[PDB]
Amino acid sequence: RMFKIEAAEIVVARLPLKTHKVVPLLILHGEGVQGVAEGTMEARPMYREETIAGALDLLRGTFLPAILGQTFANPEAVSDALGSYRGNRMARAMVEMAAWDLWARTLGVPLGTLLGGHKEQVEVGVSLGIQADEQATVDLVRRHVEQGYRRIKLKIKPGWDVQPVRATREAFPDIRLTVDANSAYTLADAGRLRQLDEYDLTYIEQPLAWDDLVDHAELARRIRTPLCLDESVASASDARKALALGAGGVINLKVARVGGHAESRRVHDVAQSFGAPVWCGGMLESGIGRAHNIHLSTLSNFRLPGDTSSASRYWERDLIQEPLEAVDGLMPVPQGPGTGVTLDREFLATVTEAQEEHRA
Template identity: 55%
Template sequence: MRIEAAELRLITLPLKFRFETSFGVQTERHLIVLTLFGEGLEGYAETVMEYTPHYREETLPGAWALLENLLLPKVLGRDFANPEQLWAEISGFRGNRMTKAALEMAFWDLWCKSLGQPLWKLLGGVRQEIPVGISLGIEPSLESTLEKVGQGLAAGYRRIKLKIKPGWDIRPVMAVREAYPEATLTVDANSAYNLNDIGTFCALDAARLDYIEQPLAFDDLLDHAKLQSAITTSICLDESITSPEDARKALEIGAGRVINIKPARVGGILASRKVHDIAQSYGLPVWMGGMLEAGIGRAANIHVATLPMFTKPGDTSSASRYWQEDIIEEGLEATQGLMPVPQGPGLGITLKRELIQRLTEKSAYIA
C-alpha cells in the first residue's frame, strides 16, 4: 500500500455540556483530522491530545509539528505491506505515542480499505456490537449528579462512571450507591490522589464499585500496587499504561486488576491488541476508554473493542451525547447499552467534508 500524500486539518468542536474532571473544565474539543491518500483511497484518523499537557505530555501544537515535519515525510512515497511495517518505520522515534498512533490508525483505515475488509475483522474481533457505559463529569451539585445517573441508567447504559477529586468523592459516590443499589458503578480519579489518601479508598470499598480508575500519579505503578494490596476494590489503570511493556509490568507487580485501553495512549491499534493479549494471558479484563473522540476516533475505538477480552462496558457511548453534529455521516448510537460496529471497509465511516471545511482553523497538504 503506497502512501502518496497527506492532509492535516485542525478543527474545534463545541461540546453539548460542560465536562469537569480533576484536570479542570472542558467545553470544546480540539483535534487534528489526518487523511492519508494512496492508490485512489483515503484513510482517516483524529488526534486526542489537547493544547495543554494535562492528560499526558503530548500537546496539539507538538503533534502538528511532528506529523508535518517528521512523521509524514518519513512515510510519504513509501510502500508498506501492512501496519506492522509502517510502525517499524516510525517506532524508533521515542515517546509521542498519541501522535504516532494517529498516523498508524489512518494507515489501518487505508490498508483495510485496500483489502475491502472492515478493521474489526482484520484485527481479530469477535463481536458485532460492544457494551458501553457513560462517563459523568463532576457536576455542580449532588442533585445534578443523581439526575444524570438516573438518565444514564434509563437510557440503558451498562455502567456509570463518576469523576472524583479530593473533596468530591465519598459523599457523592455513596449517595449514588444508595439511590441506585444495583447499578454497575465505577469512579475515575484521573491521578488526583496519593497514598496519603488511602483512607478515602478504604471508605469507597463500601460502595461496591466495579473498579477505581487511575487513583494515583499518571506515571506510577509501584504505589498503585501498594494501594491495591490495601483495598478490596479493583484498581483500573489508565494514564499509567502507555505501552504493552507497561501493561506487563503493572500486572506482574499487582498494580491493578483491570486495564483501560485507549488506543492513542498506548501507541495505536497494534499496541492495543498487544495490551489486550497481555491482559488475556493474566485472565484479566480490559475495556475501551474514551478521550472525547469525534466520529473518526470513536469508530476506531469501537472496532478495537471487538477483541475478546473487552468484557467490561467502555466509554464509547452515543456520539449525540457530545456533539450537536458529528464530523462523520454515520450515527454512532448505542441502543440499550450496546454500540453496533460499523461494517464498511476500514473504519466504515464517511467524512462530512463541508462541516470539516467549515470548522477548519488551519490546514496543510503534504505530498
C-alpha cells in the same frame, strides 16, 4: 497486496460542542483509497505530555517524509518505518491508525475484523461529573440507568467520594459502578478510599499519580476495591508491568495513548493472559476517533463497557456522514471497510482552521 502511501493531509478542525474543540486529522492516500485518523493530543499537555504543536511538527517534519512514496506490506511495517523516535505515541498513532484504515480499505474488510474482533455491538457506559450533592448524584445516575447504560462512572475527589458512592449504591444495589479518582489522591488517603470497599465498585480509576505504577501497587495492598490504570499504561510492556506488580486489575485502554491499534491489541492480549479485562477509554473524539474506538472494542477482552457513547451527546454536528448512536447501552459497529465511516468534506471545510498536503 502491498500499499504505497502517495499523499497525506493534515486538517485541523474547530468543531462546535453541544465551546469548541480542536480536532487534528490525518488523511493518508494510497491505492485509490484513503485512511483517516484523529489526534487526541491537546493544545496544552493536561491529560498527558504531548501537544498539538509538538505532534504536528513531528508529523510534518519527520513521520510523513519517512513514509510518503514508500510501499508497505501492512500497518505494522508503517509503524516500524518510524521507530527510532522516543515516546510521542499519540503522534505515532495518527499515522499508525490512518494506516490501518487505509490497509483495511484496500482489502475491503472492516477494521475490527482484521484486528480479530467479531462483535457486532459494543457495550457502553456513561461518565458523571461531580454533582452538588448526594440526591443530585442519584437523580443523574437514575436517568442514565433508565437510558440503559451498562456501567456508571462517578468522578470523585478528596472530600467527595464515599458520599456520592454511598448514596448511589444505596439506591442501586446491583448496577456496575466505578469511579474516576483523577490522580487526586495520595497514599495518606488509603483509609478514606478503603471506605469505598463496602460498596462493591468494579474499580477505582488511577487515584494516584498519572505516571505511576509502584505506589498504585502499594495502595492496592491496602484496599480491596480493584484499581484501574489509565495514563500509566502507554504500552504492552507497561501493561505487563502494571499487572505483574499488582498495580491494578483493570486497564483503561485508549488506542492513541498506547500508539495505535497494533499495540492496543498487544495491551489487550497481555491483560487477557493475566485474565484481567480491558475497556475502551474516551477522549471526546469526533466521529473519526469514535469509530476507530468502536472497532477496537469488538475484541473479546473488552469485557467491561467503554466510553464510546452517542456522538450527539458531544457534537451539534459530527465530522462524518454516519451517525454513531448508542441504544440501550449498545453501540453498533459502523458498517463498511475500515472504520466504516466517511468524512463529510463540505461540513469539514466550514470548520477547518488549517489544512496542508504533503507528497514524496
